[PDB]
């Protein structure tokens, strides 16, 4: 819910710099002379930056040597039809690149197989200034590598079509992460109204990063493999590690945890990694079901939890929820709900992004202002 | 093991521990080049079906090059 607390940045500027360098007068000639021998080379541009240069398709070597010495030989009539297919190949990829860059306007956020084939991407990963661990990670998750890599069309001149494929680096690797799920916590008083609700707004991802915590509220930035959590720190907040305390002791003096106050008596279901949280309030139906044994639980009013072991379904109202069937040990930390610490007439009825300290300060203000009369 | 999860009934929140990381820190750029030649005004009959197909492909190639030049 903190999604609007992020700063803005540029996603492709690191490639636009290389393009502005490639637009120099004697730039493309250097790259062409370098690739005149092999398909890939290391090229020191005129700005000191060393880049990898891959020649994925050589049509001049095909046109001026095999096709045009047939069309322009003499007597245009070709004997065999094999030339038509040989030219449909080696040109389908250029046509597809043109068709892609026409509708995407220079930058395609997933690098397609036509921009960079899988074998070419694997070779590029193998020949990168990265460690063996990062090489293996990218080789095993080429799909996620494509998800976070742009392809900026750069230049076409001097018989050379150029585009810079800007890839993710994955500097932080194998530092343990954890996902924080949240659900509204409301009192279960018998009244139809005057029911208070507290929620945690720090939901998302958390990762160890240089002694601090990289926290991702926007779940789009993080893809998830079996146990690997790929993320993008361009849309990440940087917190002290003590924010993790907000899991074990929310009233700690170190980190002021972020919460949310509301007065909404609506039930909800939050599917977690290896289970499901159910905030069942009012007359809403809440049923944990199984594929074999029909129904296995009916949730009492409050915020409860079930593990994905044996549970195949959580249904709240008319809303169905298929639980994630991944193995893992769940634990139920028993403890009194926090919402039972405050009073209805003093609890702030409306504060979107609040905290323990801010809610306590508003409580102080209201209590003092009422008692001074 | 390697994936454990806790549910904190106190705050009505769950935490999924046991996940490793791969955080995008910066970027790496590499130049991918396609070398193209020119089919400069080849003149030849379009009566035969095979040569007509060849011309249908030559026009596609030339238009692709020109359109790449245009989109800039």
């Amino acid at each position: 819910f903190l999604g609007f607390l992020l700063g803005v940045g540029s996603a492709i500027a690191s490639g636009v710099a290389v393009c502005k360098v490639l637009h120099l007068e004697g730039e493309v000639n250097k790259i062409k002379s370098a690739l005149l021998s092999t398909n890939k080379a290391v090229v020191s541009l005129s700005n000191g930056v060393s880049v990898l240069t891959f020649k994925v398709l050589d049509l001049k070597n095909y046109i001026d040597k095999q096709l045009l010495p047939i069309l322009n030989k003499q007597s245009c009539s070709i004997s065999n039809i094999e030339t038509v297919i040989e030219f449909q190949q080696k040109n389908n990829r250029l046509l597809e690149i043109t068709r892609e860059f026409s509708v995407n306007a220079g930058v395609t956020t997933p690098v397609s197989t036509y921009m960079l084939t899988n074998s070419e991407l694997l070779s590029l990963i193998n020949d990168m200034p990265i460690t063996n661990d990062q090489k293996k990670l990218m080789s095993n998750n080429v799909q996620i590598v494509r998800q976070q890599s742009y392809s900026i069309m750069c230049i076409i001149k001097e018989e050379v079509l150029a585009y810079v494929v800007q890839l993710p680096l994955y500097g932080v690797i194998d530092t343990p992460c954890w996902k924080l799920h949240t659900s509204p916590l409301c009192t279960t008083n018998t009244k139809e109204g005057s029911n208070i609700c507290l929620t945690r707004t720090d939901r998302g991802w958390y990762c160890d990063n240089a002694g601090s915590v990289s926290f991702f509220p926007q779940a789009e930035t993080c893809k998830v493999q079996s146990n690997r959590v790929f993320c993008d720190t361009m849309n990440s907040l940087t917190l002290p590690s003590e924010v993790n305390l907000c899991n074990v002791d929310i009233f700690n003096p170190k980190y002021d945890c972020k919460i949310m106050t509301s007065k909404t008596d609506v039930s909800s279901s939050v599917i977690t990694s290896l289970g499901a949280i159910v905030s069942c309030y009012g007359k809403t139906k809440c049923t944990a079901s199984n594929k074999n044994r029909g129904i296995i639980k009916t949730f009492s009013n409050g915020c409860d939890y079930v593990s994905n072991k044996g549970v195949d379904t959580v249904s709240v109202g008319n809303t169905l929820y298929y639980v994630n069937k991944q193995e893992g040990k769940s634990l139920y930390v028993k403890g009194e709900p926090i919402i039972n610490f405050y009073d209805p007439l003093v609890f702030p009825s409306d504060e979107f992004d609040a905290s323990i300290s801010q809610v306590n300060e508003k409580i102080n203000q209201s209590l003092a202002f009422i008692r001074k009369s | 093991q390697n994936i454990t999860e806790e549910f904190y009934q106190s705050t009505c929140s769950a935490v999924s521990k046991g996940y490793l990381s791969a955080l995008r820190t910066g970027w790496y750029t590499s130049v991918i080049t396609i070398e193209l030649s020119n089919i400069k005004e080849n003149k030849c009959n379009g009566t035969d079906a095979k040569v007509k197909l060849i011309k249908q492909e030559l026009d596609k190639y030339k238009n692709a090059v020109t359109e790449l030049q245009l989109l800039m």
Partner: antibody
């Protein structure tokens, strides 16, 4: 078949300007660039400038910088050029040549018959 | 950005090979293998016979053979004929929409 017509010859006075047009009859809508080259009576041509009519992009030689402005009308597929502040040293046979594709070709393939600009008193 | 240096004149009797040199700076030639030679019959716009470092267009005799080595080009004509009478003009790509021209060689056969 594919060719380009060229304006007629004319005469000006030192200090005036001459505007020479160059219309093409080929088309193809490609990224062709029109190049201006006024030789002399004296031996040797001299490359002046260039313009890609599809973009309006121009680039002039350092010998005539700030003196010539090359233009091109895209509706009629015609490329003009205007050389102001003429001198008798700028008397030549102003030709007009193109290159097929700016990114694929780096040599002139077709020319025009050209005009003749004499500027005396 | 000055013009190129060509020999003012060469000549050869029929049945002889003549080579015309074209020298330029590091920017014009030596860097770009984009050279072009043009002939001009006085009274008409030029018409090229070499459209790359060593490539000739459609309708050019095999005796025409070009080359290039370190800021110096070489246009070679084999078996001279009474038809190859014109002013040859060496040209070279120099950058984005910038070409440099040679001083022109004047080839008129002796025979």
């Amino acid at each position: 078949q594919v060719q380009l017509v060229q304006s007629g010859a004319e005469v000006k006075k030192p200090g005036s300007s001459v505007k020479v047009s160059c219309k093409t009859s080929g088309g193809t809508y490609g990224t062709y660039s029109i190049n201006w080259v006024r030789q002399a009576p004296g031996q040797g041509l001299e490359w002046m400038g260039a313009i890609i009519p599809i973009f309006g992009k121009t680039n002039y030689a350092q010998k005539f910088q700030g003196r010539v402005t090359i233009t091109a009308d895209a509706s009629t597929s015609t490329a003009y050029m205007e050389l102001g502040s003429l001198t008798s040293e700028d008397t030549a046979m102003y030709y007009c040549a193109r290159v097929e594709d700016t990114a694929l070709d780096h040599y002139f393939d077709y020319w025009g018959q050209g005009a003749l600009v004499t500027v005396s008193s | 950005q000055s013009a190129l240096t060509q020999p003012r004149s060469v000549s050869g009797s029929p049945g002889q090979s003549v080579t015309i040199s074209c020298t330029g700076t590091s920017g014009d030639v030596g860097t770009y293998n984009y050279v072009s030679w043009y002939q001009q019959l006085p009274g008409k716009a030029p018409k090229l016979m070499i459209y790359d470092v060593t490539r000739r267009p459609s309708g050019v005799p095999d005796r025409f053979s070009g080359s290039k080595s370190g800021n110096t080009a070489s246009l070679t004509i084999s078996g001279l004929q009474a038809d190859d009478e014109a002013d040859y003009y060496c040209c070279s790509y120099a950058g984005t929409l910038t070409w440099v021209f040679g001083g022109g060689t004047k080839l008129t056969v002796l025979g």
